[PDB]
Amino acid sequence: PTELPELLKLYYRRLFPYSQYYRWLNYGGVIKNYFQHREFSFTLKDDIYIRYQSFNNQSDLEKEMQKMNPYKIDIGAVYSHRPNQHNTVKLGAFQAQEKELVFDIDMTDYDDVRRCCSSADICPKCWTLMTMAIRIIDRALKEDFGFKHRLWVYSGRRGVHCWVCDESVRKLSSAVRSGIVEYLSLVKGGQDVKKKVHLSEKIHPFIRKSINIIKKYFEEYALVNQDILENKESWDKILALVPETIHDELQQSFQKSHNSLQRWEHLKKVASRYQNNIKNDKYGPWLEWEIMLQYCFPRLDINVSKGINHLLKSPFSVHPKTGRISVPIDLQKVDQFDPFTVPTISFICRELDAIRDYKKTSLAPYVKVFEHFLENLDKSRK
Numbered sequence: 001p002t003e004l005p006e007l008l009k010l011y012y013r014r015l016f017p018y019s020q021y022y023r024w025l026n027y028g029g030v031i032k033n034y035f036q037h038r039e040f041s042f043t044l045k046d047d048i049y050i051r052y053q054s055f056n057n058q059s060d061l062e063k064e065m066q067k068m069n070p071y072k073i074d075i076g077a078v079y080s081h082r083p084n085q086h087n088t089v090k091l092g093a094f095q096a097q098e099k100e101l102v103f104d105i106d107m108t109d110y111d112d113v114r115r116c117c118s119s120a121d122i123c124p125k126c127w128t129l130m131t132m133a134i135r136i137i138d139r140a141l142k143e144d145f146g147f148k149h150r151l152w153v154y155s156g157r158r159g160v161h162c163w164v165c166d167e168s169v170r171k172l173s174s175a176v177r178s179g180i181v182e183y184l185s186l187v188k189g190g191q192d193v194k195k196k197v198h199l200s201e202k203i204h205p206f207i208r209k210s211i212n213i214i215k216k217y218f219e220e221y222a223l224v225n226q227d228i229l230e231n232k233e234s235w236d237k238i239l240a241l242v243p244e245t246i247h248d249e250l251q252q253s254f255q256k257s258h259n260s261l262q263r264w265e266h267l268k269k270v271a272s273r274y275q276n277n278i279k280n281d282k283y284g285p286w287l288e289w290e291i292m293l294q295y296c297f298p299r300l301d302i303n304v305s306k307g308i309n310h311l312l313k314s315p316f317s318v319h320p321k322t323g324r325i326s327v328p329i330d331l332q333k334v335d336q337f338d339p340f341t342v343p344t345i346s347f348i349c350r351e352l353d354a355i356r357d358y359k360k361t362s363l364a365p366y367v368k369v370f371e372h373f374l375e376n377l378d379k380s381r382k
């Protein structure tokens with residue numbers, strides 16, 4: 001990590017997409033002081049960071065970034081005054097007023113249903129959890145809430161970010177933001193809780209449509225790549241999510257079967273014949289769905305979305321612990337996104353001078369994703 005300083009110096013001088021970055025956060029320049037009242041937080045060397053940075057224009061941002069060469073850049077809220085003037089403001093008047101609705105998803109939050117990685121590690125076997133998270137959440141944001149300007153970003157290490165940028169979304173209060181999160185959440189409980197998903201008799205359309213997305217990926221991700229029913233050590237973790245009165249019946253049919261595909265098929269048949277309520281003769285796949293949701297449904301870092309003033313790593317910032325650049329994700333190629341081809345700052349600095357802007361490097365197609373998102377914002381403003 002000692003190479004970072006000179007690599008960052010070249011990155012911010014020749015590669016960082018300043019014009020596209022300002023086109024984003026200036027939002028057409030129609031509202032006064034909108035960019036000028038935006039907080040930036042720079043992380044420097046040795047985990048030292050500065051809060052409440054703000055700039056007058058694109059040029060002032062360029063000069064300060066090329067002067068500070070920060071290890072990472074966080075974006076905060078748009079405030080009532082210039083953040084760099086917040087000490088001259090009378091107490092109580094400095095307030096966060098607007099910010100994009102953001103989401104942060106971390107692979108670590110799935111450690112209880114991951115077999116391949118743990119902590120901040122990721123691999124192709126578990127990245128499909130992010131593919132499903134993007135598609136489930138983005139569908140809800142697009143179709144259920146009518147949000148039209150959504151930027152998905154690779155966080156650089158262990159997950160993804162989403163920036164919802166509709167002008168009315170940026171005005172939402174903390175309370176409404178929490179209400180949106182609650183609408184989107186189904187997996188509830190810490191490590192103390194065994195069964196984290198419970199469904200009602202009547203399935204809300206959001207749950208049905210999310211289930212059907214998971215169904216497209218469940219066989220190859222859960223029963224092959226993860227092999228969640230490989231042996232007793234792992235299939236007892238799934239029996240913890242079903243009533244005891246059917247453990248015996250499932251225990252035997254599992255040992256008689258030979259792979260997870262067969263054992264899942266047996267679980268579905270038993271689960272759909274379990275009598276949940278003795279009052280009625282109503283049966284269904286509720287248990288089947290609760291298992292699929294607990295293993296695949298998106299798990300949000302909820303506090304990132306609730307707070308208006310919460311900082312989030314900027315797109316095209318470096319992740320200082322991996323060297324990877326936080327790059328936009330092509331929503332039209334979400335299934336093909338490979339976090340392991342994401343260029344590091346070292347990689348693109350090498351491409352630049354191998355026999356001078358980002359188009360000469362592997363960062364170019366990621367900027368094009370950002371530009372497509374920017375052109376849709378400009379169209380909604382015309």
Ligand SMILES: Nc1nc(F)nc2c1ncn2[C@@H]1O[C@H](COP(=O)(O)OP(=O)(O)OP(=O)(O)O)[C@@H](O)[C@@H]1O
Binds near residue numbers: 159160
């Ligand atoms: N110490 C922190 N203080 C403040 F004010 N904000 C913080 C601090 N640590 C993270 N954040 C913010 O939370 C966000 C989510 O934290 P997180 O650990 O998830 O970082 P990330 O940028 O999403 O990257 P990875 O998950 O892939 O490791 C960060 O992007 C922001 O910096």
Ligand SMILES: [Mn+2]
Binds near residue numbers: 105106155158160
């Ligand atoms: Mn994260």
Ligand SMILES: [Mn+2]
Binds near residue numbers: 104105106301
């Ligand atoms: Mn997080």
Ligand SMILES: [Zn+2]
Binds near residue numbers: 122
């Ligand atoms: Zn993995």
